Design a protein around this nucleic acid. Structure first.
Ligand code: FES
Ligand SMILES: [K+]
Ligand SMILES: [Mg+2]
Ligand SMILES: [Mg+2]
Ligand SMILES: [Mg+2]
Ligand SMILES: [Mg+2]
Ligand SMILES: [Mg+2]
Ligand SMILES: [Mg+2]
Ligand SMILES: [Mg+2]
Ligand SMILES: [Mg+2]
Ligand SMILES: [Mg+2]
Ligand SMILES: [Mg+2]
Ligand SMILES: [Mg+2]
Ligand SMILES: [Mg+2]
Ligand SMILES: [Zn+2]
Lengths: 174, 38, 100, 38, 162, 161, 99, 40, 177
RNA sequence: CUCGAUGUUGGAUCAGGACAUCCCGAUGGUGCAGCCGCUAUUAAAGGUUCGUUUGUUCAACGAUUAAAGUCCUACGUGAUCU
């Protein structure tokens, strides 16, 4: 179908290769991130009715992985599709006129220079972290008598409420 | 306790409150409103 | 035509007093459901070469999904379906008294 | 508008109007006469 | 009643008024001694906001109330009907007495909320964000205090505050 | 065509409840006699099965029927096996009719008999009182005499006139 | 101590239970609980609430008759109150006098 | 319930008061002999 | 009844399916009816521990009507638990956000404040419009009368009714009504 | 209430809340031309500086800022510190 105002098309799944600098004709330096599309294929189409949501969805998968390490249910799904299993599968909300047949390959030229995109991924995992690194707390002075209190949260609430509010910033997984 | 004469209106004993409520003026109500008659 | 209550659901109530006025007599025969007010019972519910055999479709479900199924089926909360400990199981009287 | 517990017309051109559930004094001749019920 | 017609013919406007058919009060009122239409028909304390057959006789074609000097109602009854008509409009019981809209005006869609016994105008009331204690509870008025004396067929009196 | 008290129809012109017109007392007196005679013939012809009755006994009321047991909460001064009549019958009912006393039915109308089958005592009832911080504590145990009665028969006679 | 004090609550809760059950049974016939209990007393029917609850469960035809009787007596009361004394007493409104 | 009504007919407010419901004998011997008077 | 013991027990303790039409009805009166049914207080065999509540199906909850100015005045308060999580919305705002919330909350507040309440709520089926699933529709038994009588609009009166009501006053013939 | 103990100022750390608003938003009045102000209505999402002396809270002073708000929270917070 032709593009219409209000139409939403599918996205991609790419691998983050690294970063690189490039300069514009005005002399300004811009660093960029290289994203390589590696074996990206449409996997499933769900109509607006069956989605349980306001829009239809199109499932995309990226990057081939070994079949020896996937669950049986996943392998039989990919067997019927006629494609090797993918590491990651993501769901893209689309309009009815943007549906693509499952099994269609997707390429980097899906996007064009000058376009603006959103990139979603899992951030780097830093494990269990204190408030200073996790939340940017100031901590306590290095000297002038501080007793085993340099990177600690301090007070976590007031005495009146006799409790800690949900959502209070505390040490934890970052 | 509070003295018999106060600057604010002193709270009444509930028995007295009931006494006042039961002894309120009830005006004579005519059978037919006088405005509805010649 | 005066009737204290409608006489179309449970019984035909007729109230009377004895001549002396010391006893109230209540005549209440049952009303039977008319035939017109009934529905008919729904009795109504290949060259296969191979004998049709029973197929077990009772796939084992995990605790969560199973409890969700039971609660929806009987319109209850999930709590009724979770087990109890030995202390409560052994306090329950297994030979309770029975009336008629 | 000045908040007032007692609204008073300050000139012959002041008029009382009830808008948005409260009384207002409006005056086109002297806008300083405008009052809002407090 | 009297109408007025404006006709522009040959770049000239003619203003005229004609006398149309006028309705007459039904004969033999049950209480001829009554001093107003309400007490002449023994209707005092016996009508409510949803009695549109009664209310519609005292309003203008666009929902406006009629003057007391014309209808002959007393101040007490005229005020009762005035409140009853406001509640009837708000309840949607007078769909053929809507305000006049100038040519080219089409109201935009607004959320439909069924309501009845509405004393105040919706737009002029604030939410009760702080209800207050039981001994000083902020109440939501229901109905009108003008109708407090209406005939009560129940043992409980009308609750005007919820 | 309007009476002095005529009121046009409004939501409050008339009461919400419907108007009820009771039967003519003269006509109803005859209809009552027919109902009493019809029920009386059912008793004479034995067109009833199991009967139940409400009897006032030991300050309280008991809905009973043949073969029932009732536990009286006191002694009755009767030897076991003795047959007695329950004389205070408030109600006797059948499948198709019921007779109500005002407040008690005549003794000629209904006869309820019972038999003493056991005279015993209740299980121990603890009575303990306690008030904190007052060294106030006392315990007492009471067993109340009881009598078990079996209802043998409920009989009605055709004495409805 | 709880066992001793529970004897008061047992009697209280039982009567609460009977009133709830009589109320449920009365509503099936379009009567409110005060109308049934109030008018049955006026007919010299001294059935207590315990028996009334048992009748509703196990004698549904007798209970409907009692509801009809109470309803009949209730309508007689209205007719009497509306009258100015001209009408004679209702058939079911007559009280049997004892001495 | 009904306490005020009973008083209007010359009866005790409580049906457990004076009257046949309370004062009449509860039982008698099946043969016919009357029972000893109740202690109450 | 002469039934066998097990069929007798089954019939007496069976669950009935009730239908209620909320169109032009105040949610409180709808809740007062549903509350009694969900608890089983309409049954002479009622007991708290007998789990004898019935099913209540309420349709047209989008068309409920409050009296007075409750649409503007009645506020529903909640708290997410987080600082600044206190939220207060009027009945009008809640109604447009969720067409079953008003009727649901009115019923939830009338049920006994015990561990059975959430089980009773499982037997309540609220639908904003006149669409009811086929399964629920097939098992309905009885429709309950609407608690409020809907007043007729002036355009719904028949000419017989209009003619029956007398004209109460004679307007002047020379008045521009 | 607590002396068979409810640790006592200011600061650090982290702040939750009120609005009687210091700044930012929207309005009425003005002895509001404009630029700046004054006063009132509405608004608590967001923000509300760094230093010299003093243990200080304050205060004075220097340099800034759209603004350097007023309060409550056991004069918030020592089983976190000083
Ligand atoms: S004079 Fe009778 S109601 Fe106005
Ligand atoms: K101390
Ligand atoms: Mg890591
Ligand atoms: Mg540091
Ligand atoms: Mg140390
Ligand atoms: Mg250190
Ligand atoms: Mg003194
Ligand atoms: Mg201690
Ligand atoms: Mg803060
Ligand atoms: Mg403010
Ligand atoms: Mg702030
Ligand atoms: Mg402190
Ligand atoms: Mg320490
Ligand atoms: Mg501490
Ligand atoms: Zn002025």
């Amino acid at each position: 179908h032709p593009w219409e105002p209000g139409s939403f098309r599918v996205g991609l799944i790419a691998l983050k290769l690294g970063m690189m600098p490039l300069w514009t004709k005005d002399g300004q330096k811009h660093v960029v991130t290289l994203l390589q599309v590696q074996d990206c294929h449409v996997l499933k189409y769900t109509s607006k009715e069956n989605c349980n949501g306001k829009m239809a969805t199109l499932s995309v998968g990226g990057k081939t992985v070994s079949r020896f390490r996937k669950a049986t249910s996943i392998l039989e799904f990919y067997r019927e599709l006629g494609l090797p299993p993918k590491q990651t599968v993501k769901i893209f909300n689309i309009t009815d006129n943007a549906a693509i047949k499952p099994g269609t390959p997707l390429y980097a030229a899906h996007f064009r220079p000058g376009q603006y995109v959103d990139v979603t991924a899992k951030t780097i995992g830093k494990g269990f972290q204190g408030v200073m690194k996790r939340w940017g707390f100031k901590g306590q002075p290095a000297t002038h008598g501080q007793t085993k209190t340099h990177r600690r949260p301090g007070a976590v609430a007031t005495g009146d409420i006799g409790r800690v509010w949900p959502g209070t910033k505390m040490p934890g997984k970052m | 306790g509070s003295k018999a004469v106060t600057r604010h209106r002193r709270v009444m004993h509930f028995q007295r409150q009931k006494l006042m409520a039961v002894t309120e003026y009830i005006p004579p109500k005519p059978a037919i409103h006088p405005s509805c008659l010649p | 035509t005066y009737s204290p209550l409608p006489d179309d659901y449970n019984c035909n109530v007729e109230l009377a007093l004895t001549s002396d006025g010391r006893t109230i007599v209540c005549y209440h025969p049952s009303v039977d459901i008319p035939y017109e007010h009934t529905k008919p019972i729904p009795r109504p519910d290949h060259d296969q070469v191979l004998k049709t055999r029973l197929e077990e479709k009772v796939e084992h479900l995990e605790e969560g999904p199973m409890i969700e199924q039971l609660s929806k089926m009987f319109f209850t909360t999930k709590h009724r379906w979770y087990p109890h400990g030995r202390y409560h199981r052994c306090r329950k009287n297994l030979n309770p008294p029975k009336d008629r | 508008f000045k908040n007032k517990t007692v609204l008073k017309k300050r000139c012959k051109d002041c008029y009382l109007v009830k808008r948005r559930g409260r009384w207002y004094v409006y005056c086109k001749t002297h806008p300083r006469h405008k009052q809002r019920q407090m | 009643f009297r109408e007025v017609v404006e006709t522009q013919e040959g770049k000239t406007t003619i203003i005229e008024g004609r006398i149309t058919a006028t309705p007459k009060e039904s004969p033999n009122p049950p209480n001829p001694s009554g001093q107003c239409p309400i007490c002449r028909w023994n209707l005092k304390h016996k009508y409510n906001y949803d009695d549109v057959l009664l209310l519609s006789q005292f309003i203008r074609p666009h929902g406006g109330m009629l003057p007391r000097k014309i209808t002959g109602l007393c101040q007490e009854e005229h005020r009762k009907i005035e409140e009853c008509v406001k509640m009837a409009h708000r309840a949607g019981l007078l769909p053929n007495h809507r305000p006049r809209l100038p040519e080219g005006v089409v109201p935009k869609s607004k959320p439909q909320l069924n309501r009845y016994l509405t004393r105040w105008a919706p737009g002029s009331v604030k939410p009760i964000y702080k209800k207050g204690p039981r001994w000083n509870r902020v109440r939501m008025p229901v109905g009108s205090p003008l109708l407090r004396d209406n005939v009560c067929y129940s043992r409980t009196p009308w609750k005007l505050y919820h | 065509s309007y009476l002095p008290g005529y009121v046009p129809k409004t939501s409050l012109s008339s009461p919400p409840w419907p108007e009820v017109v009771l039967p003519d007392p003269v006509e109803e007196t005859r209809h009552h006699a027919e109902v009493v005679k019809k029920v009386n013939e059912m008793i004479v012809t034995g067109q009833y099965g199991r009967l139940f009755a409400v009897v006032h006994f030991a300050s309280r009321q008991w809905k009973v029927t043949s073969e029932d047991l009732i536990l009286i909460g006191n002694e009755l001064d009767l030897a076991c096996g003795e047959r007695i009549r329950l004389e205070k019958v408030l109600l006797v009912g059948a499948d198709n009719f019921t007779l109500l006393g005002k407040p008690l039915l005549g003794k000629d109308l209904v006869r309820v008999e019972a038999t003493v089958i056991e005279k015993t005592e209740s299980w121990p009832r603890i009575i303990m009182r306690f008030r904190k911080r007052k060294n106030f504590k006392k315990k007492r145990i009471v067993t109340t005499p009881q009598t078990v009665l079996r209802i043998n028969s409920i009989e009605i006679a055709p004495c409805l006139l | 101590v709880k066992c001793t004090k529970a004897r008061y609550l047992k009697k209280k809760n039982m009567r609460t239970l009977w009133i709830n059950r009589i109320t449920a049974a009365s509503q099936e016939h379009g009567l409110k609980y005060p109308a049934l209990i109030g008018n049955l007393v006026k007919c010299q029917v001294e059935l207590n609430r315990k028996v009334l609850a048992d009748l509703a469960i196990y004698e549904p035809k007798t209970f409907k008759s009692l509801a009809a009787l109470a309803s009949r007596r209730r309508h007689e009361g209205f007719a009497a109150a509306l009258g100015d004394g001209k009408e004679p007493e209702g058939i079911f409104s007559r009280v049997v006098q004892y001495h | 319930a009904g306490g005020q009504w009973r008083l209007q007919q010359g009866l005790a407010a409580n049906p457990s008061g004076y009257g046949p419901l309370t004062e009449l004998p509860d039982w008698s011997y099946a043969d016919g002999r009357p029972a000893p008077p109740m202690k109450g | 009844s002469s039934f066998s013991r097990a069929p007798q027990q089954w019939a007496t303790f069976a669950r009935i399916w009730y239908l209620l039409d909320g169109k032009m009805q105040p949610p409180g009166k709808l809740a007062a009816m549903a509350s009694i049914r969900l608890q089983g207080l309409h049954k002479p065999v009622y007991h708290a521990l007998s789990d004898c509540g019935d099913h209540v199906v309420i349709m047209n909850t989008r068309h409920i009507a409050f009296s007075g100015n409750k649409w503007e005045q009645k506020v529903y308060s909640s708290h997410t638990g987080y600082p600044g999580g206190f939220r207060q919305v009027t009945a009008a705002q809640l109604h447009l956000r969720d067409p079953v919330a008003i009727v649901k909350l009115a019923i939830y507040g009338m049920l006994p404040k015990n561990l059975h309440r959430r089980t009773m709520m499982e037997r309540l089926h609220l639908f904003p419009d006149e669409y009811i699933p086929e399964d629920i529709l097939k098992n309905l038994v009885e429709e309950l009368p609407q608690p409020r009588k809907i007043p007729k609009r002036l355009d719904e009166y028949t000419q017989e009714e209009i003619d029956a009501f007398p004209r109460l006053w004679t307007p002047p013939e020379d008045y521009r009504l």
